[PDB]
Amino acid sequence: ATLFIADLHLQTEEPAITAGFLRFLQGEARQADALYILGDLFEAWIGDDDPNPLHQQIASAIKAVVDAGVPCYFIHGNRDFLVGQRFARQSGMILLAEEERLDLYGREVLIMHGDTLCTDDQGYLAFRAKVHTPWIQRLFLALPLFIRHRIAARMRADSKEIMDVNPQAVVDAMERHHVQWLIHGHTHRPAVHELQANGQPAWRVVLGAWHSEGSMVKVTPDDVELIHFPFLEENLYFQSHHH
Ligand SMILES: O=C(CCCCNC(=O)N1CCc2cc(S(=O)(=O)N3CCN(c4cc(Cl)cc(C(F)(F)F)c4)CC3)ccc21)NO
Ligand SMILES: [Mn+2]
Ligand SMILES: [Mn+2]
């Protein structure tokens, strides 16, 4: 089976999510044919030279999955678009493009973070175009780390419902790639949607954010599974009752 996750928004202020992801990497992920992380792995990223210990702890945990024979892939989210090749080398992850077409047991599948489908938020897409301009990224990354951390903290303070996808953008993307299956995150609305693309039924599968429980999509030769699971090993104890 091939696994997909997104929208973990890892951060040191939410250690339960981190513990949940570490348990996922040490368990389920080790049995997978591959693991794809479709963006927003981290709640923030200001560049690979950031010494935040969480980054090294996550890199090491992913690298153990890779070393165990499970290739791991990353598509950037809007929170962590600055993840670069230094982190890719540290974690053993392979960085992919913003859209990729996969062969999953014969099923052709488009994968993407999903924010580019949200074409009714023209303000967001304009800002997105700016922070994805290479010369702007290179200027930001050249700033001292403490300056980047101040900029990012102010921006997060200033930003504190997610616009959903545009149905026509979905059809356009799925016809550009000639697929009947699309997996994405970003909208934080885990679901399976049927539509029509390329003159045939098509499906859009949406990952959940890791808010109170984890979420993954598991693709097998036989089916597509949207799975919700607890972060920690929920230890069984017997609550007494009476009838
Ligand atoms: O995502 C969703 C829901 C939609 C959410 C849409 N809002 C969103 O994404 N936000 C809002 C606040 C925020 C802060 C971060 S950040 O703290 O990591 N960091 C800020 C500084 N960044 C920067 C980079 C560059 Cl190149 C240039 C510049 C500068 F502006 F200075 F020029 C700054 C790098 C990134 C990352 C994402 C965001 N569902 O999935
Ligand atoms: Mn997200
Ligand atoms: Mn997002």
Q: Where are the domains of the chain?
A: 2-160+162-229
The residue nearest atom 16 of ligand 1, judged by CA position, is: 44
Technique employed here was: X-ray
The total number of residues shown for the chain amounts to 243
Contact 81, 41 (CB under 8 A): no
Residue 211 and residue 155: Cα distance in Å, rounded? 22
Q: Which helix (H) or strand (E) holds 205?
A: strand 200-206
Please provide residue 53's backbone torsions phi and psi, each rounded to the nearest 5 degrees: -60, -30
Token code pair at residue 13: 């202020």
Token code pair at residue 156: 């997060």
**Which residue among 49, 115, 130, 140 has the greatest number of ligand 1 atoms within 8 angstroms of its CB, and so is best to mutate?**
140
Strand partners, 112: 99, 184
Residue 110 and residue 103: Cα distance in Å, rounded? 9
Residue 55 and residue 64: Cα distance in Å, rounded? 14
Q: Which residues contact 126 (CB under 8 A, 6 or more apart)?
A: none
- Give residues (CB < 6 A) around ligand 1: 7, 40, 44-46, 78-79, 82, 131, 136-137, 140, 151-152, 155-156, 159, 162, 186, 188
Which candidate, 164, 159, 239, places its Cα nearest to that of 206?
164
2-160+162-229 fold:
Purple Acid Phosphatase; chain A, domain 2 (3.60.21)
